[PDB]
RNA sequence: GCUUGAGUCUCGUAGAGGGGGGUAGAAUUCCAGGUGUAGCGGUGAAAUGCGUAGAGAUCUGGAGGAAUACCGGUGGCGAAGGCGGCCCCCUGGACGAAGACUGACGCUCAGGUGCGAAAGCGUGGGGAGCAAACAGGAUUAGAUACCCUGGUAGUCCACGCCGUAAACGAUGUCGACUUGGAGGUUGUGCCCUUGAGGCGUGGCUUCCGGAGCUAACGCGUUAAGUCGACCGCCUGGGGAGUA
């Protein structure tokens, strides 16, 4: 049944009510969280997620944190999937229409950037203008090409991705996120207990959703 | 504490002078504090202890 | 209060003084009576003293 | 004080309901128990539950629906201040129909469209809906 | 019946009035049917400030269970009586005995 | 505030036995007790303005428990207004 | 009739809860004396004041009244007012742990009754410090002030009046119900007491915050949320809490 072998929970007080179903913690000033209600919620997780990626999937595996943002430009990063692992520009969702064009430049650049002009204006203008480039391809990767329109959203941290989720919620687009036995639920529809900022339950489940949509329908 | 006579346990609850030391400095509880002030101040009235250090 | 200062040094090494006395409860008893307004200082020394 | 016991109930309900809390209990009798039947056999609760004898216990099972609670409201009407008592006639109807009023009669406690039925009338104990 | 400490303590020109002054007080309280479950003839001991002129008195503690009656007669006994330059009769809860 | 012989001694005095401590009639006693024991503390003092509440409190809870059996048993009420020595 | 609502009973606990009496040290003022000598005191600066009859400074003895430093703390008690040295006596309430007793005896309460800071009044005391009034010295254009040097009622005690305060949490009392978090304080059960603790279980209290509520600020299990019982009060500003 268990798959996560060091995630159980995490996170001591800080605790959020609503979070009390999927808690049976109490291991020495932190809960651990209902291991055997989290797994019932890969059922249905990973399955309404797949459901839509063969329907077509475009995702946007949201999650920062200079500590498992690499971690998530992976396979996550790969596959019929796009992804935020920095800053969550607010309203780049809401306001993805004035951001579109925070796009047009990115490419209008890099496409540029072994080509049109580059090596030469100054070699001030150089470094001095991948710096406009450097700090445009962190926050504003992922998003490059979104061809299918956000259709699901997966986020790592609930609660520290307020705005995303937010945003997600006011558009009509699914989240599917796992969140912590301290952060609010019900801003994710298909909610996943258990830790969301330990190396593993990351990667696990994170490489686990890159298992999945990946592979639907051939 | 127990006792206003224990004035070699008190002694160490007060400074030179002979002002009592605040709970926050000697880091006692609350109920202890009290019966401390008060065993104090009753070996001072027994010249078991000053209340200054004027002599 | 008391300094029996002993032999090799000049100095005044009474730092004692800013340890109790002095602009302590001097500066204290020196003027307005108070009575009920200590009250309304030391409701702000702890509502300083939380955080 | 304890003095109205019929207001708690449908007070313990519309408390624990909006606690979207599963169960509640209280202290029962007679009367508790006519309502509790009322509104299970309307289906506002899931079924209740009386555990004890000396010192009995009405228990209600909650209901929710879509993610809201069944009962969108419940009310007293009648009171210890101020008893009301509607003749058949002037018998009153919730939501234009839909929800009911518990109303106690000389042939017990029924709903609104029950005593409208039974040609009679009597103390309008709350309003449900 | 309540108990209380007691510890009078007296002028050292004043000091062979002691052994009579126990005996009295105990006599006393034993007279009314009390008992008395500590006793100290702590003798001269030095003063922790001078208390009214003179430095150095003759301490005597303690423990009696008696009548409030006995005891209002001993503070005010101990008045009367110019040679006893402090007393003070104490709590009470349960009888003492060794401490010091 | 009375003591433990003597409470218990009305106690023994009034109702079926010691145990039968809530009874009305040895309630109401054992109040009257403190009410006439108290009458001297505050003949003396007389500005002891606070434990002054306290005693009207005992007559007023006194004052009600009577009331209660009067109408209960009348029978029960008046012999003990009579034996407690009271209600001119 | 019933026992959970409300009482009674038992042993303890904490407390500036009240009333009375006793007592302690520190300082001030004053009185007396040693030493000592021309200043001290006060302000923004001054002056008035005080000192050659020796001031202030210092030391020693004494008288008197008033308040209780340190503890002391979003600490504690009380219905509110409001209650801080220490000790005894008298006394009110609150809380906890066991079970035993009464058996709806309860909640509220117009009228009524009691209590009620400070000031103020009446007779007698009492008077160190403080200080309305008043006097003097200054500042100012003026200065009936703020500042200074003085200082009477008063501030203290008993007895009796007065009955008001932003007397405020500006939030009436009682009861039932409703996510949480970190403290403070005070009982009590259990755990090799083997840790200065470990886990529970009541009372009170502070901060923060969820729903919810709000005009908003904010309140938020100590409600300003959800309901009930009863009482008090509001109905534009001024006139007027006046006639
Ligand atoms: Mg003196
Ligand atoms: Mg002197
Ligand atoms: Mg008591
Ligand atoms: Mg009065
Ligand atoms: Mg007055
Ligand atoms: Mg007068
Ligand atoms: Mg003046
Ligand atoms: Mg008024
Ligand atoms: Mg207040
Ligand atoms: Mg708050
Ligand atoms: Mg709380
Ligand atoms: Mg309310
Ligand atoms: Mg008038």
């Given at each position: 049944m268990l798959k996560a072998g060091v995630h159980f929970g995490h996170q001591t007080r800080y605790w959020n009510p609503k979070m009390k179903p999927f808690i049976f913690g109490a291991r020495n000033k932190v809960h651990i969280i209902n291991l055997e209600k989290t797994v019932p919620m890969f059922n249905e997780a990973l399955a309404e997620l797949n459901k839509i990626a063969s329907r077509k999937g475009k995702i946007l595996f949201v999650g920062t944190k200079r500590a498992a943002s690499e971690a998530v430009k992976d396979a996550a990063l790969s596959c019929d999937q796009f992804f935020v692992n920095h800053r969550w520009l607010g309203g780049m969702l809401t306001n993805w229409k004035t951001v579109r064009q925070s796009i047009k430049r990115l490419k209008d650049l890099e496409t540029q950037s072994q080509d049109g002009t580059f090596d030469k204006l100054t070699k001030k203008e150089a470094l001095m203008r991948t710096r406009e480039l450097e700090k445009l391809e962190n926050s504003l990767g992922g998003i490059k090409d979104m061809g299918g329109l956000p259709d699901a959203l997966f986020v790592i941290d609930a609660d520290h991705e307020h705005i995303a989720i937010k945003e997600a919620n006011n558009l009509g687009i699914p989240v599917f996120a796992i969140v912590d036995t301290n952060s609010d639920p019900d801003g994710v529809d298909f909610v996943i207990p258990g830790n969301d900022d330990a190396i593993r339950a990351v990667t696990l489940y994170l490489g686990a959703v890159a298992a999945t949509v990946r592979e639907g329908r051939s | 504490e127990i006792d206003y006579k224990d004035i070699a346990t008190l002694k160490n609850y007060i400074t030179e002078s002979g002002k009592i030391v605040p709970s926050r400095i000697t880091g006692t509880r609350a109920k202890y504090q009290r019966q401390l002030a008060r065993a104090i101040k009753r070996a001072r009235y027994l010249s078991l202890l000053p209340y200054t250090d004027r002599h | 209060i008391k300094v029996r200062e002993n032999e090799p040094f000049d100095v005044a090494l009474r730092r004692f003084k800013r340890s109790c006395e002095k602009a302590g409860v001097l500066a204290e008893v020196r003027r307005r009576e108070f009575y009920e307004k200590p009250t309304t200082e030391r409701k702000r020394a702890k509502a300083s003293a939380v955080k | 004080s304890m003095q109205d016991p019929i207001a708690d109930m449908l007070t313990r309900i519309r408390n624990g309901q909006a606690a979207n809390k599963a169960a509640v209990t209280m202290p029962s009798s007679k009367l508790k128990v006519a309502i509790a039947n009322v509104l299970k056999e309307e289906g506002f609760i899931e079924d209740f539950k009386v555990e004890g004898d000396t010192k009995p216990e009405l228990e209600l099972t909650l209901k929710y629906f879509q993610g809201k609670a069944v009962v969108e409201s419940i009310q007293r009407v009648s009171r210890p201040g101020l008893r009301i008592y509607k003749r058949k006639d002037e018998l009153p109807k919730v939501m234009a129909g839909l929800g009911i009023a518990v109303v106690s009669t000389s042939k017990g406690v029924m709903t609104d469209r029950a005593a409208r039925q039974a040609g009679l009338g009597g103390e309008i104990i709350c309003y449900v809906a | 019946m309540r108990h209380y400490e007691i510890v009078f303590m007296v002028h050292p020109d004043q000091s062979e009035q002691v052994p009579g002054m126990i005996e009295r007080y105990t006599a006393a309280i034993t007279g009314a049917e009390g008992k008395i479950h500590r006793?100290?003839?702590?003798?001269?001991?030095?003063?922790?400030?001078?208390?009214?002129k003179l430095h150095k008195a003759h301490y005597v503690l303690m423990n009696?269970?008696?009548?409030?009656?006995?005891?209002?007669?001993?503070?005010?006994?101990?008045?009367?009586?110019?040679?006893?330059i402090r007393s003070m009769v104490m709590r009470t809860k349960h009888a003492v005995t060794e401490a010091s | 505030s009375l003591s433990t012989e003597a409470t218990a001694k009305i106690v023994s005095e009034f109702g079926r036995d010691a145990n039968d401590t809530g009874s009305t009639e040895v309630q109401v006693a054992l109040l009257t007790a403190q009410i006439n024991?108290?009458?001297?503390?505050?003949?003396?003092?007389?500005?002891?303005?606070?434990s002054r509440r306290g005693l009207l409190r005992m007559v007023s809870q006194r004052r009600k428990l009577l009331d209660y059996l009067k109408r209960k048993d009348v029978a029960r009420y008046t012999q003990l207004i009579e034996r407690l020595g009271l209600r001119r």
């Amino acid at each position: 049944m268990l798959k996560a072998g060091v995630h159980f929970g995490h996170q001591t007080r800080y605790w959020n009510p609503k979070m009390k179903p999927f808690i049976f913690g109490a291991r020495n000033k932190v809960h651990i969280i209902n291991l055997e209600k989290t797994v019932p919620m890969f059922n249905e997780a990973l399955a309404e997620l797949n459901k839509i990626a063969s329907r077509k999937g475009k995702i946007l595996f949201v999650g920062t944190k200079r500590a498992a943002s690499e971690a998530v430009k992976d396979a996550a990063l790969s596959c019929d999937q796009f992804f935020v692992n920095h800053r969550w520009l607010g309203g780049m969702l809401t306001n993805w229409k004035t951001v579109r064009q925070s796009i047009k430049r990115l490419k209008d650049l890099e496409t540029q950037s072994q080509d049109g002009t580059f090596d030469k204006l100054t070699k001030k203008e150089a470094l001095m203008r991948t710096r406009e480039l450097e700090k445009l391809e962190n926050s504003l990767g992922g998003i490059k090409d979104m061809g299918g329109l956000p259709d699901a959203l997966f986020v790592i941290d609930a609660d520290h991705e307020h705005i995303a989720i937010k945003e997600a919620n006011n558009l009509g687009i699914p989240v599917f996120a796992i969140v912590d036995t301290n952060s609010d639920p019900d801003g994710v529809d298909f909610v996943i207990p258990g830790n969301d900022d330990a190396i593993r339950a990351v990667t696990l489940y994170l490489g686990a959703v890159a298992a999945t949509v990946r592979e639907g329908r051939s | 504490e127990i006792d206003y006579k224990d004035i070699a346990t008190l002694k160490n609850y007060i400074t030179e002078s002979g002002k009592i030391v605040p709970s926050r400095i000697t880091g006692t509880r609350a109920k202890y504090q009290r019966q401390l002030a008060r065993a104090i101040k009753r070996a001072r009235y027994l010249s078991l202890l000053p209340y200054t250090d004027r002599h | 209060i008391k300094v029996r200062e002993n032999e090799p040094f000049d100095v005044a090494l009474r730092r004692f003084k800013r340890s109790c006395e002095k602009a302590g409860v001097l500066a204290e008893v020196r003027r307005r009576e108070f009575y009920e307004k200590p009250t309304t200082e030391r409701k702000r020394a702890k509502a300083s003293a939380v955080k | 004080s304890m003095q109205d016991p019929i207001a708690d109930m449908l007070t313990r309900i519309r408390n624990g309901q909006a606690a979207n809390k599963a169960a509640v209990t209280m202290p029962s009798s007679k009367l508790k128990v006519a309502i509790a039947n009322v509104l299970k056999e309307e289906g506002f609760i899931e079924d209740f539950k009386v555990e004890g004898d000396t010192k009995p216990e009405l228990e209600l099972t909650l209901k929710y629906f879509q993610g809201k609670a069944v009962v969108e409201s419940i009310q007293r009407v009648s009171r210890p201040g101020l008893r009301i008592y509607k003749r058949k006639d002037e018998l009153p109807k919730v939501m234009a129909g839909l929800g009911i009023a518990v109303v106690s009669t000389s042939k017990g406690v029924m709903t609104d469209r029950a005593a409208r039925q039974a040609g009679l009338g009597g103390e309008i104990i709350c309003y449900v809906a | 019946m309540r108990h209380y400490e007691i510890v009078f303590m007296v002028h050292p020109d004043q000091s062979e009035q002691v052994p009579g002054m126990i005996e009295r007080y105990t006599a006393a309280i034993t007279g009314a049917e009390g008992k008395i479950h500590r006793l100290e003839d702590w003798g001269r001991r030095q003063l922790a400030y001078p208390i009214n002129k003179l430095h150095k008195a003759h301490y005597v503690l303690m423990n009696v269970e008696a009548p409030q009656e006995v005891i209002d007669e001993l503070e005010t006994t101990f008045r009367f009586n110019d040679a006893v330059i402090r007393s003070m009769v104490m709590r009470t809860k349960h009888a003492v005995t060794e401490a010091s | 505030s009375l003591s433990t012989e003597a409470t218990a001694k009305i106690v023994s005095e009034f109702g079926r036995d010691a145990n039968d401590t809530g009874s009305t009639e040895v309630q109401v006693a054992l109040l009257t007790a403190q009410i006439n024991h108290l009458q001297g503390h505050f003949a003396e003092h007389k500005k002891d303005h606070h434990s002054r509440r306290g005693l009207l409190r005992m007559v007023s809870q006194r004052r009600k428990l009577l009331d209660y059996l009067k109408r209960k048993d009348v029978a029960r009420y008046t012999q003990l207004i009579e034996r407690l020595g009271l209600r001119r």
